[PDB]
Amino acid sequence: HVLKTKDVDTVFVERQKKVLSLFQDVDQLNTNDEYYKIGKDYDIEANIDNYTNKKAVEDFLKMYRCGFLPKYNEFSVFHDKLRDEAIALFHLFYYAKDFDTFYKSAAFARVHLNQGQFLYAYYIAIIQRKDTYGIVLPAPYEIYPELFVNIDTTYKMFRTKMQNGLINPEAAVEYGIVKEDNHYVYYSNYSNAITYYNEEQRLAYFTEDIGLNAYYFFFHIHLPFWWTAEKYGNLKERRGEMYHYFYDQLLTRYYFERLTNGLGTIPEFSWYSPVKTGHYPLLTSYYTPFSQRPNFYNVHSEENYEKIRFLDAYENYFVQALQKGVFEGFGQTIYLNDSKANSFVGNYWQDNADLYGEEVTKDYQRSYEIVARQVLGAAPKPFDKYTFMPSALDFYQTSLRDPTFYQLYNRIIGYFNQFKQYLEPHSQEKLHFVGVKVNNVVVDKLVTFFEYYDFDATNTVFLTEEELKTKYPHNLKVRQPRLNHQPFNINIDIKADVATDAVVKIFMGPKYNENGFPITLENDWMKFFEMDWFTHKITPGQNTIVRNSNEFVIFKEDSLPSTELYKLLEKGKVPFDMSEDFGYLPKRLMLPRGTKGGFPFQFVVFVYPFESTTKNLTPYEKFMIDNKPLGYPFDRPVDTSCFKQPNIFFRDVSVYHEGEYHAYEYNVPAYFSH
Amino acid sequence: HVLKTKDVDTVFVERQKKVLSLFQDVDQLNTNDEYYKIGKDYDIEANIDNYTNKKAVEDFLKMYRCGFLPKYNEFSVFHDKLRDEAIALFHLFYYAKDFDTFYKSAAFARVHLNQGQFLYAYYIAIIQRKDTYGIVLPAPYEIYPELFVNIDTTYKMFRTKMQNGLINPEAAVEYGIVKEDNHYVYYSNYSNAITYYNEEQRLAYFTEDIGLNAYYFFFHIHLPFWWTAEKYGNLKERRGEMYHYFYDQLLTRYYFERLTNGLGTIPEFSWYSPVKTGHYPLLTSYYTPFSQRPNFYNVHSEENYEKIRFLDAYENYFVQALQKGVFEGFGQTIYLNDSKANSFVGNYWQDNADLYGEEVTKDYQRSYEIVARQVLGAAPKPFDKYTFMPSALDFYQTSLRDPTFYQLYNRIIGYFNQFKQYLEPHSQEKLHFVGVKVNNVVVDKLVTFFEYYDFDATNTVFLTEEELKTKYPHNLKVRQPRLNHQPFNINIDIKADVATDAVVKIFMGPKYNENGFPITLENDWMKFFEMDWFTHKITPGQNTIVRNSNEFVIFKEDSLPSTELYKLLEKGKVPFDMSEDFGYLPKRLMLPRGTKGGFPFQFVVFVYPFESTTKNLTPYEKFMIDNKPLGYPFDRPVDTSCFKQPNIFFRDVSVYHEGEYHAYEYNVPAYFSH
Ligand SMILES: *[C@@H]1O[C@H](CO)[C@@H](O[C@@H]2O[C@H](CO)[C@@H](O[C@@H]3O[C@H](CO[C@H]4O[C@H](CO[C@H]5O[C@H](CO)[C@@H](O)[C@H](O)[C@@H]5O[C@H]5O[C@H](CO)[C@@H](O)[C@H](O)[C@@H]5O)[C@@H](O)[C@H](O[C@H]5O[C@H](CO)[C@@H](O)[C@H](O)[C@@H]5O[C@H]5O[C@H](CO)[C@@H](O)[C@H](O)[C@@H]5O)[C@@H]4O)[C@@H](O)[C@H](O[C@H]4O[C@H](CO)[C@@H](O)[C@H](O)[C@@H]4O[C@H]4O[C@H](CO)[C@@H](O)[C@H](O)[C@@H]4O[C@H]4O[C@H](CO)[C@@H](O)[C@H](O[C@H]5O[C@H](CO)[C@@H](O)[C@H](O)[C@H]5O)[C@@H]4O)[C@@H]3O)[C@H](O)[C@H]2NC(C)=O)[C@H](O)[C@H]1NC(C)=O
Ligand SMILES: *[C@@H]1O[C@H](CO)[C@@H](O[C@@H]2O[C@H](CO)[C@@H](O[C@@H]3O[C@H](CO[C@H]4O[C@H](CO[C@H]5O[C@H](CO)[C@@H](O)[C@H](O)[C@@H]5O[C@H]5O[C@H](CO)[C@@H](O)[C@H](O)[C@@H]5O)[C@@H](O)[C@H](O[C@H]5O[C@H](CO)[C@@H](O)[C@H](O)[C@@H]5O[C@H]5O[C@H](CO)[C@@H](O)[C@H](O)[C@@H]5O)[C@@H]4O)[C@@H](O)[C@H](O[C@H]4O[C@H](CO)[C@@H](O)[C@H](O)[C@@H]4O[C@H]4O[C@H](CO)[C@@H](O)[C@H](O)[C@@H]4O[C@H]4O[C@H](CO)[C@@H](O)[C@H](O[C@H]5O[C@H](CO)[C@@H](O)[C@H](O)[C@H]5O)[C@@H]4O)[C@@H]3O)[C@H](O)[C@H]2NC(C)=O)[C@H](O)[C@H]1NC(C)=O
Numbered sequence A, B: 001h002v003l004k005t006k007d008v009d010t011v012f013v014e015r016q017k018k019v020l021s022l023f024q025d026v027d028q029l030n031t032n033d034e035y036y037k038i039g040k041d042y043d044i045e046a047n048i049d050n051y052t053n054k055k056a057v058e059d060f061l062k063m064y065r066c067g068f069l070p071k072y073n074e075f076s077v078f079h080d081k082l083r084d085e086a087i088a089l090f091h092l093f094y095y096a097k098d099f100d101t102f103y104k105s106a107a108f109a110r111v112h113l114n115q116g117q118f119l120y121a122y123y124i125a126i127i128q129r130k131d132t133y134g135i136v137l138p139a140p141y142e143i144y145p146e147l148f149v150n151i152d153t154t155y156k157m158f159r160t161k162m163q164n165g166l167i168n169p170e171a172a173v174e175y176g177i178v179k180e181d182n183h184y185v186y187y188s189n190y191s192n193a194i195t196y197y198n199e200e201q202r203l204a205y206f207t208e209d210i211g212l213n214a215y216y217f218f219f220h221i222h223l224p225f226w227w228t229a230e231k232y233g234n235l236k237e238r239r240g241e242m243y244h245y246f247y248d249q250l251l252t253r254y255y256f257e258r259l260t261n262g263l264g265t266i267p268e269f270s271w272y273s274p275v276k277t278g279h280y281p282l283l284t285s286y287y288t289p290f291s292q293r294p295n296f297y298n299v300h301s302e303e304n305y306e307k308i309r310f311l312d313a314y315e316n317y318f319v320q321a322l323q324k325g326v327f328e329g330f331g332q333t334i335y336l337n338d339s340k341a342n343s344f345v346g347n348y349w350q351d352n353a354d355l356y357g358e359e360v361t362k363d364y365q366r367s368y369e370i371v372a373r374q375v376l377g378a379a380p381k382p383f384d385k386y387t388f389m390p391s392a393l394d395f396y397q398t399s400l401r402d403p404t405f406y407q408l409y410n411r412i413i414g415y416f417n418q419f420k421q422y423l424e425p426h427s428q429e430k431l432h433f434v435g436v437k438v439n440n441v442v443v444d445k446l447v448t449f450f451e452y453y454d455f456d457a458t459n460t461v462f463l464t465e466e467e468l469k470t471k472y473p474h475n476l477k478v479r480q481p482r483l484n485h486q487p488f489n490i491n492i493d494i495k496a497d498v499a500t501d502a503v504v505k506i507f508m509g510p511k512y513n514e515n516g517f518p519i520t521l522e523n524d525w526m527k528f529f530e531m532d533w534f535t536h537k538i539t540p541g542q543n544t545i546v547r548n549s550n551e552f553v554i555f556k557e558d559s560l561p562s563t564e565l566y567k568l569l570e571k572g573k574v575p576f577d578m579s580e581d582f583g584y585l586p587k588r589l590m591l592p593r594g595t596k597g598g599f600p601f602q603f604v605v606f607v608y609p610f611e612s613t614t615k616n617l618t619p620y621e622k623f624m625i626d627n628k629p630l631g632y633p634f635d636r637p638v639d640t641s642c643f644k645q646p647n648i649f650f651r652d653v654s655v656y657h658e659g660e661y662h663a664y665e666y667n668v669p670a671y672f673s674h
């Protein structure tokens, strides 16, 4: 298995080395590095002429003169002042006229501002600036190891650094600390191996997967809720569509994990009754432990009365709109069938900038998602504007760790899917592909298994004044068994009458509901996970297509450590997926953990006429090369018909699991010591 | 102000240095230290002849061959397996025939067992073994810094050790990190300065005071609930009495702190309703954050049903016994007026070894306190016998930090005080001192203030292989402004007729109830804090006594750091209080924080005939040199009478507070950088 690579010129390579120079030992400053002197003395005001938007820069300065979040404090975009500062910072980076000005702005920021706040604006700037297009971003778990690994392993790294190596390596082995080459390897268990407070803990290997959590973080920075979608042209008009698609797919993939673990549908809750499934974040900030929500949390308390009425009202508005058939307010009147309706409900539920036709959201435009994450997070009200006790719901890089996160968005998509039933359902005629039939589909054996994976967690530790004079060590490694599956082929047999350009799509859906009974398309259309999307020319007669799972366009390869990036740059190359598909879901997680006996699911291949690509979303996600609504043909319900279309085929499939079933078994000392 | 000292011989000095050699860098093992070689190869089986009790040793070996709690895990005496192991370990220490066998056993333990478990059994053995009587114990906050200081300062020490010093001292100052001499000083705030989740936070300077918390730890190791009081001869028959006294005194003192902060009486709760006052420990173990209990915690959940029914039953039993006038069970039938009844209720509520007439409690003799701490701590059930998420209620060294601790014991003493109204109240004649009269009592100005206090927190950090080759650094200093007061005199005027040996006691009580109205002796007799106890020969005629607060026998001086202990040993001396009164409440806390305008209270002096001391508790606490019930004459209600005895005087008093009201103000960088 070789990793696909991409060629880049020298200018790119130089910029790449520059951006990465600001991603090292992030919680510490290195006066021996070039960026320090540059950032320390940089004069924004003096160079105001090197920014394309002066007002934006003057606002950053007016704001910066009043002080920003101090260093070491936790930064979160869900907190007003913190967000407003980050956005102003983003504008400073985004409006830089050229890479040079941008780099100096970033250098200035790294030196003078809070580490988290800078990293947040920096990551986004790199994604939005045209001149940095394609520049590879380091894996989020590499930059924020303290948000991707439980404290028990973070403290082990702290111990090692304080002792300056292992004092008794034979002993350290028993606690998962091993020395390989010049690296210190730490086997890190998911939380279910240390605390089992509720049945949801059985999903810890998935909900805590560093790839899965990185994926949500990337979803955010690719296009923040607080920013207009303007930059991506067409994406603006189709924003609500992308909102629905991202979440429905995420909720579905998560539901599949619940299914093979016998956990049923995503639980429903009430703002007026105790929230049943708690969560204990085994994470910590520099000032406090993350807030915990115990099982059966009494959410309806004095501290939340008003917030709960706001959330309830936000919901009533949407339910009442659906009932009277029209959305009123926000400067318009949209009937459910309006062509702008879909984006309106998505922008409404997210409370993003495009809902207001502005470029950035304001403080007073209260967000349903923000307040919900607030009361579900269970943290006491913030001490002040710069100080708060964080919860897993306060970060895009830790959200998928909390069960209520899926419960909250499932509630939101619940409303979205209700909206979908008022739309014109796909008719049988429109779904029918004349002259094209799928005679058969064969799927190789589906098998999952856990496989060790390492990532550089050196940012966890602080360096010595002497160490800062030499090259960064990239010394520590975190090792964890991560979900994976064996590659598999899907054989598609198509009998055609005439020759045409077709689009073939591949989905995975459940076979049975939570009670073990047959699925029903009328009620389960929203439970189909899109796995592949590609064009193919069909010739009259027999057509045989063979797609390997490794070719599925929806997924990406695992990120590489920043160190391996450097070696690849020496050859004028960068990892292909890491460069253009950083926001895709890791292909190793495309299949939910199976069972020893094999768990039932079903694949479905749908092929339709390839036509208009006038409003595609290629600038955002490469695989969105069509005019069809995202998720087609399962983007909305379909005109019920107990009679299948010839151009669609369902195949029963079973997902088995090899090796040890529990991930923690691979972290048992007696095992990894062989 | 000089500290009282005591002379010790050469044998004592040698034993003192030995015990202290095992209290260094406790979370780490030093192969260069003599104890490592001794301990690593000590063969208990081979020296089984060097133990006064062969059975206990064999039980230990039998248990040890099966495995003990692993190193680094949290140890708590409230968990069965952990306790039984700790107790077996204590027996191995206690039965050593001589100091030398004891020391070797200790070294063995230090090398082979869990650090927390070792320290616990070690601390107790030094207190219990006769040959170690007088040996000075190091401050608990110096041994368990991670239990006496919040993570924000712990993390600063970690960052310092990792950087191997300060990289930018000028910047460090802004985070309360300063360098003094060869020490790194860390200004540490109480939690109310970082998070204010409920009004009880206003009491953080008191509830988190290291001395107050150390005081509870000393109370416990002086005589564990799981051990018989046999060793202390007389105390055994008066154990229940001591229980009542200790908690009543502690609860009353805590009540005073509440009063000067406008927080009213200690809150009452129900096991069937949400617990109002939550608590967020800013502490952490090596594997998990301490459990948090949000405000209005839903305690009556499925996980606690059975435990709550047990707690209910436990209370029911007592209330029914009071109603029918008799305590049945436990191998006897006691009427409320029995002479052993007082000791029974105390032993019953604590579920101690003496309640059952055994030397140590068994796992199946379920405890009210343990189960109550369990449900109030709000932690999920333990992962397994060796792994649990700790709460402030799992340690005698952090218990007083949780508001529910006071609520729990206030509930208990609530029942104990109800039981006391069934007893014969003190008659006016037995309280009268014929011939003795207190004409007047004048109290000097009562003033409180905050004053910096340092302690060695180096145990927080891990030492380097090289650092272990040289002497321990005792490098880190934690600095916190701690409550204190100016010394004050109490002038007593006594007019006598005849000459007799008298006992004079000094109490402090409230002037008004929570609503600002006059106190009533009938309902507030249990609200008097004992401050002094001493004998005095009264001469006929005018008698003038002057007692300085520094002389009150109830309190002790602050502990000295281990390093100062060594210097003092060279002189063949040891702190007096630290050696003989380690269990007393630190005198700097005898007064609650006052208010700028002076908060109302009252002092009361009571003098009575000095006589019998046949059943005194001097072997336990020095100041208990009489036969009268602990807390006399406020140990039980008194035959209501409207004309006070001439040998008792009540004097109004005001407690003022000077300097900054809030402790955190003294940790503001602009302030301590002067
Ligand atoms: C415990 O607990 C407690 C309780 O909680 C705590 O306490 C706290 O603390 C804190 C901390 O410390 C605090 O805070 C702080 O404060 C401070 C002070 O303040 C003050 O002052 C200021 C200043 O002033 C000045 O200036 C101005 C302008 O701006 C003017 O106007 C004036 O006049 C003056 O002037 C003067 O001076 C100057 C100097 O400065 C000079 O120039 C001359 O001399 C002149 O003459 C000010 O500003 C203020 O003000 C304020 O306030 C007031 C009142 O009082 C008002 O009226 C006003 O308006 C203002 O504002 C306010 O208000 C508003 C509205 O209402 C609100 O919002 C609020 O309130 C505000 O505040 C005063 O007066 C200060 O300074 C600080 O600051 C800082 O931080 C912040 C945040 O927090 C920011 O924003 C800013 O910016 C800053 O930053 C900085 O720092 C930090 C640290 O901290 C860091 O992190 C950052 O990064 C930065 O850094 C920088 O700086 C520093 C210094 O500072 C240094 O060091 C550094 O350096 C380093 O690094 C670098 C890199 O980057 C390198 O290069 C080097 O090398 C190294 O070294 C840098 O440079 C703060 O704010 C508080 O307050 C407290 N609280 C209380 C209650 O008290 C404690 O802490 C604890 N403790 C423990 C241990 O834990
Ligand atoms: C993630 O997550 C996951 C999930 O959770 C986890 O996992 C986990 O893990 C853990 C840990 O690792 C584990 O545990 C462990 O295990 C192991 C194994 O086991 C097994 O084995 C054993 C042994 O065997 C042997 O022996 C015996 C006698 O005793 C016999 O009998 C047999 O036969 C064998 O034989 C052999 O022996 C030897 C070897 O060894 C030789 O001689 C020869 O070879 C011979 O042949 C056993 O015992 C066991 O048993 C058990 O099991 C079974 C079944 O399987 C059964 O049958 C039995 O009975 C038992 O069971 C049970 O019982 C009950 C139930 O009913 C209960 O009780 C329980 O369950 C039990 O178990 C098996 O088989 C082991 O080994 C370990 O141990 C340890 O630990 C403990 C606690 O934990 C204790 O107690 C003990 O004692 C021990 O300790 C140790 O270690 C530690 C650490 O770990 C520490 O801390 C301490 O201190 C100690 O130490 C020592 O040792 C070590 C080693 O071992 C070393 O290293 C050291 O050294 C050092 O130090 C010193 C000082 O001290 C110095 O001097 C030096 O230099 C240095 O080096 C020392 O020496 C444990 O137990 C588990 O299992 C798991 N789980 C699962 C589910 O899987 C993971 O971990 C995670 N990860 C992360 C990363 O986090």
Ligand SMILES: *[C@@H]1O[C@H](CO)[C@@H](O[C@@H]2O[C@H](CO)[C@@H](O)[C@H](O)[C@H]2NC(C)=O)[C@H](O)[C@H]1NC(C)=O
Pocket (backbone or CB within 6 Å): A331, A332
């Ligand atoms: C008052 O609020 C209205 C409604 O939001 C604003 O009207 C909008 O103005 C923008 C230009 O900034 C137009 O693009 C929109 O089409 C307008 N919408 C509607 C419904 O009128 C108006 O600008 C605000 N008035 C002032 C003085 O700020």
Ligand SMILES: *[C@@H]1O[C@H](CO)[C@@H](O[C@@H]2O[C@H](CO)[C@@H](O)[C@H](O)[C@H]2NC(C)=O)[C@H](O)[C@H]1NC(C)=O
Pocket (backbone or CB within 6 Å): B331, B356, B357, B358, B359
């Ligand atoms: C049956 O119960 C009695 C009392 O409940 C047990 O006797 C006690 O035994 C312990 C020894 O562990 C002694 O320390 C106590 O003094 C005894 N008390 C009484 C009242 O007898 C007896 O051990 C139990 N039966 C068995 C077989 O253990």
